[PDB]
Design a protein around this ligand. Structure first.
Ligand code: NDP
Ligand code: SF4
Lengths: 156, 114, 290, 80, 208
């Protein structure tokens, strides 16, 4: 019982430390990259939340796929995806990314990004408003809040 | 019907250019299978390469054979550079069956295929 | 039967095939390749789990748009399991932790779990249920592991007898247990024969058995196509590795006994080609040095 | 010591080494196009194999007009 | 027609008419049509053997400077023995006029690499080779740009369909990205939209 209490408080602590900052890498092919830059704006700060734009892949917390994936882009996309630390989460920003969008019935366009990586947050819009993307990142933080990792390790 | 050629005079110079291209592809395999960290033996890839050469075997116009020589030349330049990746070289193979045979009984169990 | 259960057109990637497969475990390695082959086939897969959604998330995008579905179960209650097999065409038991834990020893997982799920699956009325086990699981000595598996096979034959008991040999793939076990070393020289069999032809045989009729009731086994020496195996993985939870139960499982059985069909009798060690072993033996 | 028949014997055992013709059945009266049944694909494979073993550049026109293992060894003795 | 109608410059109509008649009279070897649009841009329709001579003429000769190169396009038109249309577009710096050099071509017989007279035509030729297949002899570099290198088929033809034959996904079986045949989850509902009743009687082609 008291071991359960310790595991619960420790799991909540480390999940809180994970959901604290979460700096991504800005992948950003098309105009949704411009809107990522506009949610790096003074009027909508990533830096109030610990979110930092940083193209270093080896310290990427989450990854924002935003833009139009193509057949020539996809192998390099997953090759970037695999050189990432093991706690990883994916935010698909944009109508192109979360299901193909306007270029859906076309060659040289991967139908969304379910066909390459696992996706965790879908934020739609063309472009999704910085407002909407930031609501998506807050909902990502609350997904990280509900994870019970070390509790499942304890009752394993 | 005076039509311009591309390179050759009949199918004979076309055979010369395509056997030069086949020699280049044959001695171009082991560097690729050594470089790309592949998964398949040398002779199997060489057999599928010569099978691809066997595939187009009923072409008689000189312009078409010359243009296929040009296509193979472009692809050989790209493979002897490292511009292409592991996905493309595995995409030349067809390991993702789809084992769909020409058996009319097997064509009948999964059908509507004239 | 109701429509939209028949196969539709071609096969694969929302070219709708026939079965609806409820799969247990499937966070594990063989279960992950089986889910991958069902997503290649394009059937609808229902997998329940008990872990974090992270692991089922990384096996998620292998499935197509909504074709796989994730639900939940516990290691005790029949209720969530029956809820998982309410609407289920076929069902497979792929469960098992290869050591004892503080909340689950070897008892009652292989004992209680196939009993309960075969009970509720017989009550639901499934066909072509397939339970996996290991080869050479006998009642005899020196193997709590294998004798619990033999008890479980007797359970599967006794309750819900219209099943398929199946057993492979030591299977190897990209995330093998024993190849990593032989790499993660530092070691004893004795006599042992052993046959390994590559994983994807095994699971293609599994899906061939589950979608084809005439194979119910029969128990199946899978045979390594060369059946060579343990010491030659260790020296071969040593020379190709280019470097000139380990309990006693695991090391006895890998050293003690392996043998063939002629009662029951192997690979090509079911209608699938078997492929030997060499090519895929050269594939998977990366991670030499820097 | 650059003998004729020593080069002919190394030609003989690399022809033994080649796999897509069975049995050996080899002679200087071979003319292995259709008398021993080889494709021009296999022809240019064997040509470039000799070229790789002990040959010079061996351009494919005169290499194409060889058609015979005797004349292969004679053209190596001609050029080299 | 005094409001809401775009006016047109008949001065430019007469000037482009006189200039086109000038060019057509001074190069009789290759000129086949010179037409003036009703919206006044000049069109010169050209046999595909005076590519290099007419471009050397049009870049120079100082009665028509035309240094600026716009597009080179290829428009895929069936029901013709010579299918494709290589469309050079030229713009004069000193004069403010635009001419469309429409030279025709077939599937196989090449044209002759305008990069020797126009450096801007280089990547345009590479792109039109990759997308259509109009062969460009005497050219240094014909490679693939705007496709995948494993992809082929020259997809800007009308013969190539909308959705391509290949489709990528990832699988953990071979641990990599694979290319399967196309499996659309939705039809791409095509709409028959062309109503009858002859929206333009001036453009009535004659019957048989
Ligand atoms: N040497 C071998 O590896 C061979 C193994 N087999 C059989 O295959 C299986 C092992 O396959 P593999 O993928 O390598 O290993 P795993 O242990 O990973 O597969 C078992 C899966 O079921 C889950 N599981 C097991 N027991 C419980 C439990 N009590 N409660 C909840 N979940 C449980 C596991 O963890 P989680 O709950 O976190 O999902 C895992 O997802 C075993 O059943 C074994 O008999 C057969 C031949 C050879
Ligand atoms: S979803 Fe819209 S804004 Fe975003 S990349 Fe696509 S076209 Fe651009």
């Amino acid at each position: 019982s008291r071991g359960e209490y310790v595991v619960a408080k420790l799991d909540d602590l480390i999940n809180w430390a994970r959901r604290s900052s979460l700096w991504p890498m800005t992948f950003g092919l098309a105009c949704c990259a411009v809107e990522m830059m506009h949610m790096a704006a003074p009027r909508y700060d990533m830096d109030r939340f610990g979110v930092v734009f940083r193209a270093s892949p080896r310290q990427s917390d989450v990854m924002i796929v935003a833009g139009t994936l193509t057949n020539k882009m996809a192998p390099a996309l997953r090759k970037v995806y695999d050189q990432m630390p093991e706690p990883r989460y994916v935010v698909s920003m944009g109508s192109c990314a979360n299901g193909g969008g306007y270029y859906h019935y076309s060659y040289s366009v991967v139908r969304g990004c379910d066909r390459i990586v696992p996706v965790d947050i879908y934020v739609p819009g063309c472009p999704p408003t910085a407002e909407a993307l930031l609501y998506g990142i807050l909902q990502l933080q609350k997904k990280i809040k509900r994870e019970k990792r070390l509790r499942i390790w304890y009752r394993r | 019907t005076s039509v311009k050629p591309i390179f050759s005079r009949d199918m004979n110079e076309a055979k010369r250019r395509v056997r030069e291209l086949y020699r280049a592809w044959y001695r171009e395999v082991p560097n690729t299978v050594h470089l790309f960290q592949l998964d398949i033996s040398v002779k199997q890839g060489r057999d599928k390469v010569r099978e691809m050469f066997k595939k187009n075997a009923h072409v008689t116009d000189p312009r078409v054979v010359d243009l296929l020589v040009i296509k193979g030349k472009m692809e050989l330049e790209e493979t002897i550079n490292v511009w292409k990746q592991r996905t493309h070289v595995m995409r030349f193979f067809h390991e993702t069956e789809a084992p769909r045979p020409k058996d009319f009984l097997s064509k009948f169990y999964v059908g509507h295929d004239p | 039967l109701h429509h939209a259960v028949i196969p539709h057109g071609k096969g694969g990637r929302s070219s709708v095939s026939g079965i609806v497969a409820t799969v247990f475990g499937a966070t594990g390695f063989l279960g992950r390749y089986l889910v991958n082959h069902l997503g290649r086939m394009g059937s609808q897969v229902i997998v329940p789990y008990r872990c974090e959604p992270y692991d089922t998330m990384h096996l998620r995008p292998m499935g197509d748009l909504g074709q796989i579905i994730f639900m939940d179960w516990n290691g005790r209650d029949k209720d969530s399991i029956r809820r998982a097999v309410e609407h289920s065409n076929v069902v497979i038991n792929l469960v098992g932790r290869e050591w004892e834990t503080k909340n689950f020893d070897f008892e009652d997982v292989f004992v209680k779990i196939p009993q309960a799920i075969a009970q509720v699956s017989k009550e639901a009325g499934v066909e072509k249920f397939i339970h996996i086990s290991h080869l050479n699981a006998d009642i005899k000595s020196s193997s709590k592991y294998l004798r619990n598996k033999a008890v479980g096979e007797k359970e599967v034959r006794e309750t819900f007898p219209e099943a398929t008991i199946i057993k492979p040999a030591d299977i190897f793939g990209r995330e093998d247990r024993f190849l990593n076990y032989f790499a993660n070393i530092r070691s004893l020289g004795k006599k042992t024969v052993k046959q390994p069999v590559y994983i994807v032809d095994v699971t293609k045989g599994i899906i061939n058995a589950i979608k084809d009729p005439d194979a119910r009731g029969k128990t199946f086994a899978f045979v390594g196509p060369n059946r060579y020496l343990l010491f030659d195996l260790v020296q071969y993985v040593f020379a190709v590795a280019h470097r000139p939870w380990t309990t006693r139960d695991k090391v006895e499982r890998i050293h003690t006994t392996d043998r063939t059985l002629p009662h029951l069909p192997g690979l090509e009798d079911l209608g699938v080609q078997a492929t030997p060690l060499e090519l895929k072993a050269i594939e998977v033996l990366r991670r030499h040095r820097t | 010591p650059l003998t004729l028949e020593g080069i002919k014997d190394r030609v003989l055992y690399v022809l033994k080494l080649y796999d897509k013709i069975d049995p050996e059945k080899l002679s200087v009266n071979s003319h292995f196009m259709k008398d021993l049944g080889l494709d021009s694909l296999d022809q240019v494979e064997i040509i470039m194999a000799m070229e790789d073993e002990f040959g010079f550049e061996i351009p494919d026109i005169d290499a194409e007009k060889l058609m015979c293992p005797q004349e292969i060894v004679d053209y190596i003795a001609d050029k080299k | 027609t005094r409001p809401t109608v775009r006016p047109r410059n008949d001065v430019a109509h007469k000037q482009l008419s006189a200039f086109g008649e000038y060019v057509a009279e001074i190069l009789p070897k290759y000129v086949q049509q010179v037409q003036v649009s009703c919206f006044s841009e000049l069109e010169i329709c050209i046999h595909p053997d005076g590519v290099i001579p007419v471009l050397t003429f049009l870049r120079d000769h100082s009665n028509a400077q035309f240094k600026s190169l716009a597009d080179l396009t290829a428009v895929d038109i069936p029901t013709r023995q010579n299918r494709f249309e290589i469309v050079y577009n030229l713009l004069s710096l000193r004069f403010n006029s635009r001419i469309r050099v429409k030279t025709y071509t077939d599937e196989l017989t090449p044209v002759e690499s305008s990069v020797s007279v126009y450096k801007a035509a280089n990547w345009y030729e590479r792109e039109i080779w990759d997308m259509f297949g109009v062969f460009f002899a005497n050219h240094p570099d014909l490679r693939r740009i705007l496709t995948d290198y494993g992809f082929e088929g020259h997809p800007f033809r009308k013969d190539f369909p909308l959705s391509g034959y290949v489709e990528l996904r990832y699988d953990d079986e071979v641990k990599r990205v694979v290319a399967e045949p196309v499996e659309l989850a939705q039809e791409f509902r095509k709409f028959d939209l062309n109503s009858p009743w002859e929206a333009f009687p001036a453009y009535r082609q004659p019957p048989e």
